[PDB]
Amino acid sequence: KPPKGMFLSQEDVEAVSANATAATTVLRQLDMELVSVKRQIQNIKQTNSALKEKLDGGIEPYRCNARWTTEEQLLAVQAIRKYGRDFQAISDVIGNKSVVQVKNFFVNYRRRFNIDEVLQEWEAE
Amino acid sequence: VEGAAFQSRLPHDRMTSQEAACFPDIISGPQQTQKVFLFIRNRTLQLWLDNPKIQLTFEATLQQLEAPYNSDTVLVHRVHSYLERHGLINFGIYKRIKPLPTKKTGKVIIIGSGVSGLAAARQLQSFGMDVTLLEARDRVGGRVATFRKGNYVADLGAMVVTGLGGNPMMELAKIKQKCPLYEANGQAVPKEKDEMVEQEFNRLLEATSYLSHQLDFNVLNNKPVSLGQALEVVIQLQEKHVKDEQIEHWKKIVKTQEELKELLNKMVNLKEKIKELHQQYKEASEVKPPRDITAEFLVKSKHRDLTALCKEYDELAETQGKLEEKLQELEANPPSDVYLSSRDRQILDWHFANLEFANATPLSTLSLKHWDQDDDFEFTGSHLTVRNGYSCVPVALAEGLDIKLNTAVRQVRYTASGCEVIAVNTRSTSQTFIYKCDAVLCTLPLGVLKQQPPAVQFVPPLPEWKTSAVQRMGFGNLNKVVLCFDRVFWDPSVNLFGHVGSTTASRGELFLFWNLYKAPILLALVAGEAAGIMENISDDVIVGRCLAILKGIFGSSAVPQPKETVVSRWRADPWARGSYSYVAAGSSGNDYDLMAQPITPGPSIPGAPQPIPRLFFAGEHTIRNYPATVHGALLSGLREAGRIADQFLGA
Ligand SMILES: Cc1cc2nc3c(=O)[nH]c(=O)nc-3n(C[C@H](O)[C@H](O)[C@H](O)COP(=O)(O)OP(=O)(O)OC[C@H]3O[C@@H](n4cnc5c(N)ncnc54)[C@H](O)[C@@H]3O)c2cc1C
Numbered sequence: 001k002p003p004k005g006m007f008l009s010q011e012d013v014e015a016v017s018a019n020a021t022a023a024t025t026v027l028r029q030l031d032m033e034l035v036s037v038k039r040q041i042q043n044i045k046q047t048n049s050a051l052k053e054k055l056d057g058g059i060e061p062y063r064c065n066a067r068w069t070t071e072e073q074l075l076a077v078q079a080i081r082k083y084g085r086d087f088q089a090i091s092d093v094i095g096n097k098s099v100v101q102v103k104n105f106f107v108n109y110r111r112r113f114n115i116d117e118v119l120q121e122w123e124a125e
Numbered sequence: 126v127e128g129a130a131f132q133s134r135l136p137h138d139r140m141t142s143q144e145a146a147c148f149p150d151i152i153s154g155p156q157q158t159q160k161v162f163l164f165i166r167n168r169t170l171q172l173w174l175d176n177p178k179i180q181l182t183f184e185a186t187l188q189q190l191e192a193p194y195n196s197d198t199v200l201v202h203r204v205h206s207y208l209e210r211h212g213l214i215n216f217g218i219y220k221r222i223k224p225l226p227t228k229k230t231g232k233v234i235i236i237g238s239g240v241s242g243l244a245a246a247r248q249l250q251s252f253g254m255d256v257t258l259l260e261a262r263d264r265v266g267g268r269v270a271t272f273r274k275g276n277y278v279a280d281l282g283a284m285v286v287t288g289l290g291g292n293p294m295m296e297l298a299k300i301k302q303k304c305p306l307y308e309a310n311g312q313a314v315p316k317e318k319d320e321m322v323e324q325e326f327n328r329l330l331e332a333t334s335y336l337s338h339q340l341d342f343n344v345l346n347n348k349p350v351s352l353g354q355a356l357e358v359v360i361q362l363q364e365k366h367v368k369d370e371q372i373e374h375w376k377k378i379v380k381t382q383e384e385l386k387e388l389l390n391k392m393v394n395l396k397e398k399i400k401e402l403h404q405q406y407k408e409a410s411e412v413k414p415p416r417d418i419t420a421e422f423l424v425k426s427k428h429r430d431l432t433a434l435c436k437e438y439d440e441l442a443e444t445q446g447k448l449e450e451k452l453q454e455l456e457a458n459p460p461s462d463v464y465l466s467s468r469d470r471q472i473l474d475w476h477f478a479n480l481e482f483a484n485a486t487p488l489s490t491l492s493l494k495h496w497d498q499d500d501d502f503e504f505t506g507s508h509l510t511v512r513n514g515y516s517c518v519p520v521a522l523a524e525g526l527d528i529k530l531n532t533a534v535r536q537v538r539y540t541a542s543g544c545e546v547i548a549v550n551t552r553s554t555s556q557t558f559i560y561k562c563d564a565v566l567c568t569l570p571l572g573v574l575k576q577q578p579p580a581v582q583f584v585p586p587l588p589e590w591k592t593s594a595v596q597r598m599g600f601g602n603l604n605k606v607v608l609c610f611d612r613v614f615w616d617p618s619v620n621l622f623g624h625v626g627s628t629t630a631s632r633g634e635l636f637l638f639w640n641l642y643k644a645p646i647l648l649a650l651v652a653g654e655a656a657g658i659m660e661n662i663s664d665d666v667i668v669g670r671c672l673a674i675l676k677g678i679f680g681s682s683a684v685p686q687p688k689e690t691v692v693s694r695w696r697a698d699p700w701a702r703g704s705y706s707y708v709a710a711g712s713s714g715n716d717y718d719l720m721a722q723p724i725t726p727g728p729s730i731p732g733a734p735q736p737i738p739r740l741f742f743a744g745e746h747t748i749r750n751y752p753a754t755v756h757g758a759l760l761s762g763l764r765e766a767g768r769i770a771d772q773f774l775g776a
Pocket residue numbers: 236237238239240241242259260261262265266267268269281282283284285286287532533534535568569570573580581603604695699700701703704705743744745746752753754755756758
């Protein structure tokens with residue numbers, strides 16, 4: 001097999017000899033494919049460099065208890081019509097109820113906060 | 126005993142095809158007797174070799190064997206005779222003990238007092254045959270040819286003994302195999318580079334061998350493939366794979382910056398979708414705290430939805446940073462720009478000139494498949510030079526012998542009855558000579574056998590099969606400039622040093638300088654396509670380019686005008702018509718074997734018994750395994766002398 005760091009496919013030999021200039025056809029149409037891909041690189045760098053501008057500033061100017069208030073219960077139900085089953089969201093919104101206490105409430109009331117009826121509403125996204 | 130078999134190019138432990146045919150007794154017989162044969166052989170050779178300055182008679186051989194060996198003494202004799210016939214013992218120059226056969230048997234005309242000739246002549250004379258050599262030159266030795274003025278001494282043909290390790294061969298000198306190069310301007314080549322390229326050269330060659338054997342790329346367009354063609358193909362394929370790398374890299378840069386793009390998008394369309402939410406939240410947060418639960422929700426909802434999308438964007442913002450250094454790395458790991466520089470491909474061109482030198486032809490011409498068929502048989506040992514001039518050997522071999530100098534053979538006539546050689550005086554063309562003989566040994570160079578309108582007619586003509594081999598195999602060229610000076614201005618620790626030519630087309634031109642000799646002499650080799658062109662370029666111009674080259678390398682004022690100059694023109698020399706044989710594309714080494722098969726004339730009267738062969742060939746161009754050397758000649762000679770004695774004195 002070829003000495004280390006020489007490259008010789010059955011294929012490539014047939015292909016650089018198949019006529020009397022396949023020789024320097026093949027070398028050039030790579031030379032040319034090379035400049036194409038360098039030009040694509042400059043274009044996609046300019047494009048990218050614009051969006052880094054649009055991102056200038058970042059988003060800098062843009063930032064418990066187990067007794068349920070009635071305030072809290074109503075925040076829950078509403079969170080349900082707008083978060084279905086995302087107990088982490090519902091808990092984030094209610095402010096002061098672990099992700100369990102949500103899941104519990106979610107059953108304890110279930111019947112009399114029409115929670116099934118609420119969730120078939122949330123179906124419709 | 127067994128490293129005397131090697132010193133005789135024989136296996137110590139097996140009998141050879143030769144031995145088989147002269148001793149079918151022993152080799153078809155029991156393994157025990159073979160060992161006895163092989164001992165007696167190896168020992169007789171050792172004995173000869175231990176003191177080859179004097180004849181080893183059947184007598185002395187028997188005296189210095191022991192044990193159960195001088196038991197069987199027809200065997201010691203049958204062997205000793207076989208060795209002396211095939212020129213393995215009592216060859217070259219030896220003090221005879223039993224002086225020469227009183228009166229001689231058979232008459233041989235040898236054409237050429239080159240080494241192949243002299244070697245055969247001595248053998249044939251030693252076997253009591255009437256030998257006369259016809260030489261066109263005013264000297265012996267042929268392509269062994271030594272210039273000699275004052276204490277100046279320089280070989281214009283053979284100057285090396287490429288090994289003593291089983292070589293049938295006067296003051297030999299090791300070659301300091303350390304060779305500095307010197308680009309066109311005069312600048313040495315950093316050892317850094319010299320090594321890069323020598324390795325690339327070495328790899329490029331193995332590459333052609335692979336390209337030949339494994340990939341079977343030996344034809345292309347009906348025409349067969351030169352080492353040249355293969356090397357270019359390999360070098361192109363290397364250039365191509367430079368670019369194939371260049372691409373796949375600058376391409377895995379784009380793929381990476383179309384991930385940065387796709388993401389810088391998500392990250393812009395979040396800045397926006399987050400601006401909205403933060404408005405919408407400020408707004409809902411106006412409606413102030415004594416508020417109903419549908420608007421405390423609308424505040425809280427937003428506040429959640431907004432620290433969600435703020436995390437999400439920070440998550441996309443470390444991703445931004447990875448993809449951005451990942452890219453800044455690749456932007457500073459460019460793969461190799463080029464396969465080889467220009468200064469590089471120019472030093473490669475010199476490593477190729479060194480190849481064009483040894484093989485004495487353009488690589489355009491060498492068989493890819495077969496240029497190196499002789500390679501398994503290179504001798505062992507230091508490659509040496511002859512300090513005192515190689516001429517010493519032909520001359521030494523010539524004394525004793527009937528050599529007609531200034532005798533150019535014009536026609537060779539061979540018939541069932543015998544042969545006549547028609548020759549003339551080179552100093553008057555007009556004066557004619559007719560040598561009648563039992564057999565003719567032709568040691569005419571392949572150059573001469575090839576002369577397009579013949580220098581020498583064979584009557585009758587050599588058969589198709591012979592002339593076809595002569596046409597097929599290559600006869601190359603390699604010339605020298607002898608530079609004689611008053612003072613040793615080069616580095617005397619250094620045997621040889623290169624000059625790198627500007628172009629490919631000129632890699633041969635005074636590409637390499639040798640310091641070999643007692644006197645202040647430098648040899649300048651012209652190889653490759655150069656060798657051929659420079660022959661048609663005035664002596665003065667050539668010595669010009671030499672001094673130019675030398676002044677650039679050594680300092681424009683350390684380099685005197687030369688006392689004496691010589692310049693070989695071997696292709697133009699009509700007794701040589703070149704330097705030596707090479708296996709051309711579409712030849713093989715089989716041709717070396719055809720070149721050596723002797724010719725047997727048709728019968729004189731029809732329906733008469735099958736003749737005896739008459740026309741025999743030796744010379745450099747007739748020995749498959751040692752072409753293009755002195756030893757190979759020397760052997761071809763000893764060989765023919767055997768084949769002829771086996772016929773005209775019986776086997
Ligand atoms: C420049 C050069 C460098 C070489 N370097 C080396 C080296 O370093 N080491 C090495 O081992 N080998 C070397 N060789 C090879 C070596 O010189 C030859 O292989 C060998 O000397 C030739 O042996 P030969 O007897 O076959 O040929 P030749 O010496 O050619 O003998 C043939 C003879 O025939 C004569 N002749 C030609 N036409 C006629 C005619 N019509 N009638 C009569 N006589 C005729 C010629 O003048 C010549 O004497 C070199 C060869 C050359 C040219």
